[PDB]
Design an enzyme around this catalytic site. Structure first.
Site, PDB file in Angstrom:
ATOM      1  N   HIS A  18       7.313  -2.576   3.888  1.00 48.14           N
ATOM      2  CA  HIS A  18       7.147  -3.905   3.885  1.00 48.14           C
ATOM      3  C   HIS A  18       8.258  -4.568   2.978  1.00 48.14           C
ATOM      4  CE1 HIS A  18       3.312  -3.462   5.935  1.00 48.14           C
ATOM      5  NE2 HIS A  18       2.856  -2.874   5.126  1.00 48.14           N
ATOM      6  N   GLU A  62       0.692  -3.908  13.279  1.00 49.96           N
ATOM      7  CA  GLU A  62       0.167  -2.770  13.048  1.00 49.96           C
ATOM      8  C   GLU A  62      -1.211  -2.489  13.920  1.00 49.96           C
ATOM      9  OE1 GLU A  62       1.075  -3.693   8.306  1.00 49.96           O
ATOM     10  OE2 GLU A  62      -0.895  -3.007   8.909  1.00 49.96           O
ATOM     11  N   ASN A  91      -1.073   8.001   6.534  1.00 47.76           N
ATOM     12  CA  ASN A  91      -1.509   7.722   7.730  1.00 47.76           C
ATOM     13  C   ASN A  91      -0.544   7.901   8.797  1.00 47.76           C
ATOM     14  OD1 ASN A  91      -3.407   6.187   5.810  1.00 47.76           O
ATOM     15  ND2 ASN A  91      -1.701   4.478   5.666  1.00 47.76           N
ATOM     16  N   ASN A 113      -7.132   4.768  -8.389  1.00 51.03           N
ATOM     17  CA  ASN A 113      -6.422   5.281  -7.291  1.00 51.03           C
ATOM     18  C   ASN A 113      -6.988   5.279  -5.903  1.00 51.03           C
ATOM     19  OD1 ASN A 113      -7.329   8.096  -6.150  1.00 51.03           O
ATOM     20  ND2 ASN A 113      -7.191   8.304  -8.163  1.00 51.03           N
ATOM     21  N   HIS A 130      -1.395  -8.629  -1.731  1.00 53.34           N
ATOM     22  CA  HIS A 130      -2.509  -8.254  -1.341  1.00 53.34           C
ATOM     23  C   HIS A 130      -3.647  -8.380  -2.432  1.00 53.34           C
ATOM     24  CE1 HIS A 130      -4.407  -5.369   1.882  1.00 53.34           C
ATOM     25  NE2 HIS A 130      -5.161  -6.310   1.674  1.00 53.34           N
ATOM     26  N   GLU A 184       4.474  -8.885  -0.915  1.00 51.63           N
ATOM     27  CA  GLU A 184       3.332  -8.680  -0.908  1.00 51.63           C
ATOM     28  C   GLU A 184       2.499  -9.037  -1.862  1.00 51.63           C
ATOM     29  OE1 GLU A 184       2.051  -5.082   1.582  1.00 51.63           O
ATOM     30  OE2 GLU A 184       0.110  -5.097   0.650  1.00 51.63           O
ATOM     31  N   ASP A 237       0.766  -1.141   0.126  1.00 49.60           N
ATOM     32  CA  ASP A 237       0.003  -0.042   0.036  1.00 49.60           C
ATOM     33  C   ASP A 237       1.066   1.175   0.170  1.00 49.60           C
ATOM     34  OD1 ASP A 237      -2.099   1.968   0.461  1.00 49.60           O
ATOM     35  OD2 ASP A 237      -2.297   1.100   2.458  1.00 49.60           O
ATOM     36  N   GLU A 266       0.651  -9.094   4.175  1.00 50.25           N
ATOM     37  CA  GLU A 266      -0.732  -9.409   3.414  1.00 50.25           C
ATOM     38  C   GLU A 266      -0.418 -10.059   1.945  1.00 50.25           C
ATOM     39  OE1 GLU A 266      -1.461  -4.978   3.647  1.00 50.25           O
ATOM     40  OE2 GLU A 266      -2.962  -5.626   4.753  1.00 50.25           O
ATOM     41  N   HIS A 305       7.468   3.685   6.246  1.00 52.42           N
ATOM     42  CA  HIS A 305       8.034   3.474   4.880  1.00 52.42           C
ATOM     43  C   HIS A 305       9.194   4.440   4.530  1.00 52.42           C
ATOM     44  CE1 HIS A 305       5.236   0.829   2.512  1.00 52.42           C
ATOM     45  NE2 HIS A 305       4.293   1.219   3.256  1.00 52.42           N
ATOM     46  N   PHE A 341      -5.537   7.531   1.058  1.00 52.83           N
ATOM     47  CA  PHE A 341      -5.139   6.520   1.893  1.00 52.83           C
ATOM     48  C   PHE A 341      -4.039   6.391   2.187  1.00 52.83           C
ATOM     49  CE2 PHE A 341      -5.806   2.246   3.633  1.00 52.83           C
ATOM     50  CZ  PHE A 341      -6.867   2.581   4.432  1.00 52.83           C
TER      51      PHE A 341
END
Ligand SMILES: [Mg+2]
Ligand SMILES: [Mg+2]
Ligand SMILES: [Mg+2]
Ligand SMILES: [Mg+2]
Ligand SMILES: [Mg+2]
Ligand SMILES: [Mg+2]
Ligand code: NA
Ligand code: NA
Ligand code: NA
Ligand code: NA
Ligand code: NA
Ligand code: NA
Ligand code: NA
Lengths: 1011, 1011
Positions: free
Chosen positions: A379, A525, A592, A585, A406, A404, A189, A449, A345, A589
């Site tokens: 990640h 998390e 965070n 997109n 996901h 990942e 993400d 994920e 990140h 999000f």
């Protein structure tokens, strides 16, 4: 062939992974970690050309520079230079899901560099090139000749250039592909970029070299004795005169040394490794490594001759620490850890995903400065320098493999497929081979994920076999599968279960005692910090402290992934998903963080800092009990400051030094405090200050604080008798009250105070009306994708109920003249489709002192969604520079996120009463306020409030903070009650029951006056 | 790119592995397992061309056939056609150890085939080709276009030819490389061949198809109820109308059936597998599968529309059985197994490594007929049909991955290397995906002799994860590492430890109880049947039966790997290592079987059959107790034959029905037996006979037997007084005794009987002399690598001590005339370089009955290596057709291998008294003999003997059995004592102590007479 569309080919002619090398040719230079002339950085200006696909790349490019190419800086992500759009998608893959194929329109980045090597590098030795980061796959050519291929955007790819080098000018040609089969394993993400975003360098090693080495430290029951075991591997021609010496250094002192010829012990029927040797060093009373005191030693590995000739030397920092899980607890040097971590990140507002020392140091200082002692590499493997800094500054690290998936369906489609085991395995094994000697890394993670597949079990076991010194964890498939030593859920709540099918998220307290469970629980998390969030954060810490096996977690996350764009005038603004034409997109999000992209803190950071304090306090009488949560260090740089105040008025204080040992207590007796007979509440505030500066903080740094109410003396004295008595003027349309030069006007049609005057100057731009809604916070909206109409979300429930469209029907509006005042009584009913949502009953009492007492009693239909807030709002004509108040502050605080706020007299510039969240929403509120002062106005009571130049409506309709315009006058929101902001996650209702306004009937009163 | 030199590339465009497919379009045909029109065999005559390297292959070959190419049969190994030479090497790789490179002169086999394809197959669906076995790597082209690449010589490689084919004629071009990086994982101790040695076929599947399916069977505590779970996966057009119907058949009766749409249960946050479905069928009182009773059900998997349209059907035989390890025991359907197994290589003396149904059936019938119930696929997945036969005939199978890196140094250099993980995982993962549905497979093996590397742990864990129904075992690195559920050593001895450094081989009894050990122990390899071997075999079975956790093992091995060659006269002979100019080689170490390459039994087989009997017996008075070792069956096809005999003369006998429950006992009382007054020993012999024929045996088949000595009556009657008395005639050179028609001549210079006369004809070609040596057996020589001398080997100790060249020195020779006979007394001393090795003292007494009593007393120096034998030998002038003796027989038997032999009167043609071991050695002995008759001669006493046309010297000097030439007359070896043959392994002394001739002094007597 199309190697970027075949998971069976993850590389071609790539060298084996290994720990950081520098091929020092001088042992002293290696010990001090000084530069090595054998290691060269090729970072700088390169020649770059962009293409729509690899087929469009002209063959001539392999032989010489294309005049169309531009000169750009490397490392870098070409989306940051504007060659194409960076893409922000969360779960859904940026490309059509059709493994192993990728789109034929594959943005191709052609990099090239002209360089030359030292004569000696041409004579002898092995010259290899190292690309620490290439997103996502690439081919390499040297002087027109094809060298190799590589994948995995987060680990180094090395190639031997010895047979391609030539005298004079040499030319590298690097064709980078944005998409490849590896992209299927890199669905994190975050912003989707590409290019050579990490260092590029040239390493020159001897033919007979150190090709690998591992450092391990085992201890005795009390850690008073340790054994450093170093396995050293070599390449080249074996010779009897060869030797390996491993020396351990503590500063300029050599505490231990070991020498031996190659030839390991026998391991099986065919003998042993003739090209390896293991040295064992005895270390008495070693200084242990921990986040608290990052004690480090220096290990120097020398490949030399028996008669003293050094061939080459490698080295690393060593931290003596034992990480083991015993009886359900994660132990570090025998002590149960309490993880105060955060997910971080590698993001930069200007450089995208290119990291630099300055930025990493800044993050580390802010983190430690805010009581964090751990970080998760979400990640993927980080920039090599990150581990060095963590080792030295002191931070527990979770090294996570770059895997990942996901976006797959189910999430484990690839990970459970044996055909992807190879590609997956290199991302796990090459990480361990690169980072295993770092002491800061205490936990290995198989990725993020990707559901739970058999490939996870295979890799879990591999690590366990290769490196038993560190626990392995993985959240995928339920957070407690057979592939994790730690129960590591993401967003599991404290007391509330979320019985999702297959992968439920049990309340963490319950998860621990499930039949058969014995493992420790640390959330990989939790506390999703998206926008105005982190509500309920304290609930997690109360649980972490009470439950031995609940050992903390890592907040999600550190920094907003917003990018910088410029308008017509060249002014910068924070952009997010979709702002680059990228689509699909997932909008905002990508933000965070506890801090903004430029590392400016969000209000939430203070809450995390407070809850993550290392000293706990208890009060009893005159005694303050200080308890240390430190496991190893003594409080040798702390003194306690204590101050007592009456309604913000300082009354007493003093300081006491802290002499508390880890897990120990200290009793501090406060002296006799003067007896104030003056009405008011006495408050005691203490704070731990670090008098001395450190590697991560300045002198005077505050690391903890806490407040307590002491004695309170209720006021029983009545206010001065009103000399005058206000007069009422009636009209069918208005009720006017006048006193002195003050005038109050109540509109009989709306039943609201529509205007006030001090002299001939108007005070209101908008009438004083009840308000039951708020500009939706990211947590109220709840969506991890810019394409989901969720009826369960709070904002949606408020819309469906008509809370935002409810019109105020007047039921009563009367006026009564009293002995020394005018009493105005009103009653409204907000309805929608014939449904009465709320009923508001008020009385306004204006006496001869010019003070307006407002009494409010509201009724909320039990069957309508609980309102965002219960209060009043209006737009003042006034526009002052300061905001002075007696309440919780100085920073923004909400009902379920105010533990860090302190009660006192705060005074800030108006702008600071506004929180610049990139995605606008209700903000700047302050709770527990007993007195608010703005311009000539003063409001008294026990309310919550926010005040700024932006209306709830504008905030609600504006997508980016840079698009907000200051409205005329000042907007004021005075709340008797405000709903919690929540945060356990940002895609489902997360405001705890005790913070939802569901009492049905609410009461609150205020006093408005001048001066 | 040279993909055959890149372990990172093990295939290109290869299809996923799956269980056996046939793609029936008619369910009844699937149920009956009848031929499928959608499955074609491309076996037959192909075009082949040999090249010295791939670069020598002309391009025209892709577009069309080559003139010089020949027409050969496929499958086949091209070495068997004489294109190049097969190589027999054991440990040392056949190529230079320099991974991942192979020699540039890599033999390349170009195979091609022009075949037909009906347009119907191209009109719809998918047309794929399947190569069951290509050694060792290959490239594939169809109609001049490149298709793909593949490695792993022991598993099927499939490619989609849909887009490469055209109606009518099509041409395949397969370039097979002899060497590749895969060869580094195929260093098994066997012949190194190459080519398309397994079936090639063409399969048609519809677009929407069954791409995989797993069958499993779980039971309740008593196996009275079971659940059959079948997970089916599809590929193609996924629609709501799709369904899967699994039906279970027992013959023509459908016992169960389930139907469901696709869409597996939710597994993670992204959902579940919409392309999968799990059917669960209840089955009451299921007929259990086992080697004892291979009960099978038929499972049919129908992919079809909900409305009844069968798209396609797949199927398999189902064996309801549970395999689990509990409390230290391996259990089959709740009962502890006793593995009577054997390792079997896919070998044929004419076709090499190409397997055929007939041969497989022959091995299976022979194995079961010899009480074997299990087989190890040493050391790679076997021909697909093997598992079907084992499922149906009933044999427990250990499926082993094709991974052996024995030649590396250390042995785990590649297996502990993460870079070889990809290549290894495919050899393991693809094996499981292919054979996981066969009930005969009860144990998964990670390979063989590749040390123990981290890669073993990861793959061990992978299997445990994807298939929890079968234990996982692996011997590498010590037989008891973390990569095996079973302690599975190779050649660990019963009582003697072999404390090798790092990987010791403990006595199996001791291994079980080492501190903390709890696992069952089943030797993956034991009782090395190389040449005259299997000595001490009975010792293993006594232990297996006494120790619960010692659950048997797999003998090494089934069939000698000898290849047929022809002489100038066109006659065939058995060849071994080096016989094809192949060098370096390991000569005869490729022959270690219980049967010859043509499946003719070695004498050892009978010893194995006897020790592996399923019925145990005990004798007490006139009551015989029979105990069944069967776990699930009753003795419903067995009767007991008993016979009592006085020195071969049968007195009584009878039959008794065997009615024994599994693990049960039955007492059988023998009738009042006769009581002969005549001298002699009464012997009881019982045999278990199977009256009815089975799928694996014929009526009358004897499955077990046992003997006991009953009452004995020692002869106390004196022989009739002799009328005459022998006359003596002396001369300086001789002592000549004469009686009637008999004459004896003793040479006074040598001290030996140099000649005899019956009537007036010579009887000796060579004098009667002492012999203390024998033509060394393979176990006496020992050298798994012909390039390793060894002073510790028995043959070397005997040579060094001069046992083979010591010459008898006469110490005495006298003659005396007794009252009724002549007595000759001699004494001899054998010496070597001044050392007296042995001393032989004898007496020869010739009386009036014409008989000659020989009394021998030998002294053996205690410091000289114990002698191979202690006896006499001579060359009889006679050559008779028959050999009749009273003693152990009828087959060859030695001290440490004679339990199978039975005491009785045997009579065989001379030829059967010689065992044609490919590598000549001492052979054909028979122990416990009290009487031997050959021609006019008779020998009485208590001795061991062999008799044939070949002298110990010739046997000793000849390398192959076809080079042996009958000598004049017959060579007789009569031993008072013979050393054990050993066999625990064939590379170090293995003859147990109790079977070594170390008493220092030995005595034996023989009487020679004319019958
Ligand atoms: Mg690839
Ligand atoms: Mg994700
Ligand atoms: Mg030194
Ligand atoms: Mg290859
Ligand atoms: Mg081997
Ligand atoms: Mg039907
Ligand atoms: Na805790
Ligand atoms: Na996010
Ligand atoms: Na202190
Ligand atoms: Na907004
Ligand atoms: Na047993
Ligand atoms: Na062998
Ligand atoms: Na019977």
């Amino acid at each position: 062939r199309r190697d970027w569309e075949n998971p069976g080919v993850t590389q071609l002619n790539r060298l084996a992974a290994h720990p950081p090398f520098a091929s020092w040719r001088n042992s002293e230079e290696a010990r001090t970690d000084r530069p090595s002339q054998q290691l060269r950085s090729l970072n700088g200006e390169w020649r770059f050309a962009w293409f729509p696909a690899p087929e469009a790349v002209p063959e001539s490019w392999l032989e010489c520079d294309l005049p169309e190419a531009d000169t750009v800086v490397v490392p870098s992500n070409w989306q940051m230079h504007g060659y194409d759009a960076p893409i922000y998608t969360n779960v859904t893959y940026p490309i059509t899901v059709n493994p192993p194929f990728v789109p034929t329109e594959n943005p191709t980045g052609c990099y090239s560099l002209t360089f030359n090597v030292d004569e000696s590098w041409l004579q002898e030795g092995q010259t290899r090139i190292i690309f620490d980061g290439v997103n996502s796959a690439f081919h390499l050519w040297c002087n027109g000749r094809w060298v190799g291929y590589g994948q995995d955007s987060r680990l180094p790819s090395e190639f031997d250039l010895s047979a391609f080098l030539r005298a004079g000018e040499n030319r590298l040609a690097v064709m980078v592909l944005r998409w490849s089969d590896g992209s299927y394993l890199e669905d994190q993400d975050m912003w989707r970029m590409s290019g050579i975003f990490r260092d590029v360098s040239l390493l020159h090693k001897p033919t007979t070299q150190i090709s690998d080495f591992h450092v391990a430290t085992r201890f005795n029951d009390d850690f008073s004795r340790a054994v450093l075991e170093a396995e050293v591997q070599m390449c080249g021609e074996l010779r009897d005169y060869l030797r390996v010496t491993v020396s351990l250094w503590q500063g300029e002192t050599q505490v231990a040394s070991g020498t031996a010829p190659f030839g390991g012990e026998i391991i099986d029927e065919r003998g042993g490794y003739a090209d390896r040797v293991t040295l064992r060093l005895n270390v008495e009373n070693p200084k242990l490594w921990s986040a608290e005191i990052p004690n480090l030693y220096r290990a120097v590995v020398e490949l030399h001759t028996a008669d003293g000739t050094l061939i080459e030397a490698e080295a690393c920092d060593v931290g003596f620490r034992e990480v083991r899980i015993e009886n359900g607890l994660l132990l570090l040097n025998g002590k149960p850890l309490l993880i105060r971590g955060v997910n971080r990140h590698e993001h930069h507002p200007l450089h995208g995903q290119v990291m630099d020392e300055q930025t990493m140091v800044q993050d580390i200082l802010l983190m430690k400065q805010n009581n964090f002692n751990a970080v998760r590499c979400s990640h993927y493997p980080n920039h090599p320098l990150w581990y060095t800094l963590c080792d030295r500054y002191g931070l527990y690290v979770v090294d996570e493999a770059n895997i990942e998936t996901h976006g797959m369906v189910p999430m484990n489609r690839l990970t459970d497929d044996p055909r992807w085991l190879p590609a997956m395995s290199e991302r796990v094994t090459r990480m361990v081979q690169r980072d295993r000697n770092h002491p800061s890394v205490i936990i290995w993670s198989l990725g993020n994920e990707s559901g739970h597949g058999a490939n996870h079990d295979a890799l879990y076991r591999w690590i366990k076999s290769v490196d038993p010194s560190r626990p392995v964890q993985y959240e995928g498939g339920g957070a407690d599968t057979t592939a994790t030593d730690i129960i590591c859920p993401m967003y599991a709540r404290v007391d509330e279960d979320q019985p999702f099918p297959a992968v439920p998220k049990w309340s963490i307290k319950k998860w621990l005692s499930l039949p058969g469970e014995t493992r420790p629980l640390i959330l990989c998390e939790y506390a999703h910090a998206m926008g105005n969030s982190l509500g309920g954060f304290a609930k997690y810490w109360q649980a972490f402290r009470q439950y031995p096996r609940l050992q903390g977690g890592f907040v999600w996350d550190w920094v907003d992934q917003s990018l910088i764009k410029y308008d017509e005038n060249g002014n910068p603004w924070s952009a997010y998903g979709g702002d680059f034409g990228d689509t699909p997109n997932d909008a905002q999000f990508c933000m965070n963080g506890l801090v903004f992209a430029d590392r400016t803190p969000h209000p939430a950071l203070t809450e995390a800092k407070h809850q993550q304090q290392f000293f706990q306090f208890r009060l009893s009488g005159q005694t303050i009990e200080v308890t240390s949560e430190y496991l190893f260090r003594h409080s040798d740089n702390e003194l306690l400051h204590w101050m007592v105040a009456l309604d913000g008025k300082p009354l007493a204080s003093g300081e006491v030094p802290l002499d508390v040992a880890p897990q120990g207590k200290q009793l501090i007796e406060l002296p006799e405090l003067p007896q104030p007979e003056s009405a008011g509440q006495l408050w005691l505030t203490v704070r731990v200050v670090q008098p001395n500066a450190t590697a991560w903080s300045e002198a005077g740094h505050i690391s903890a604080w806490q407040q307590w109410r002491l004695a309170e003396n209720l006021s029983v004295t009545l206010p001065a008798a009103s000399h005058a008595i206000p007069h009422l003027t009636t009209s069918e349309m208005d009720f006017c009250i006048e006193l002195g030069n003050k005038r109050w006007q109540f509109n009989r049609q709306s039943g609201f105070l529509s205007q006030m005057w001090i002299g001939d100057k108007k005070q209101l731009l908008t009438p004083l009306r009840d308000q039951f809604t708020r500009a939706p916070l990211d947590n109220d909206i709840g969506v991890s994708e810019a394409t989901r109409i969720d009826p369960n979300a709070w904002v949606e429930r408020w819309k469906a109920a008509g809370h935002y469209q409810a019109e105020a029907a007047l039921l009563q509006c009367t006026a009564d003249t009293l002995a020394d005042a005018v009493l105005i009584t009103t009653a409204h009913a907000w309805q929608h489709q014939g449904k009465t949502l709320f009923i508001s009953r008020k009385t306004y009492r204006i006496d001869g002192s010019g003070q307006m007492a407002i009494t409010v009693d509201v009724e909320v239909a039990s069957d309508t969604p609980h309102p965002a807030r219960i209060g009043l709002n209006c737009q003042l004509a006034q526009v002052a520079e300061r905001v002075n108040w007696l309440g919780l502050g100085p920073q923004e605080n909400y009902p379920d996120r105010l533990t860090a706020a302190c009660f006192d007299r705060w005074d800030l510039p108006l702008s600071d009463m506004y929180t610049p969240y990139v995605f606008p929403s209700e903000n700047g509120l302050r709770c527990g306020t007993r007195e608010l002062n703005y311009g000539p106005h003063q409001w008294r009571g026990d309310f919550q409030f926010n005040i700024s130049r932006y209306s709830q409506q504008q905030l609600m309709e504006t997508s980016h903070r840079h698009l907000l315009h200051a409205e005329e006058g000042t907007w004021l929101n005075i709340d008797g009650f405000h709903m919690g902001i929540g945060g356990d996650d940002s895609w489902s209702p997360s405001v705890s029951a005790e913070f939802q306004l569901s009492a049905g009937r609410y009461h609150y009163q205020l006093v408005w006056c001048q001066k």
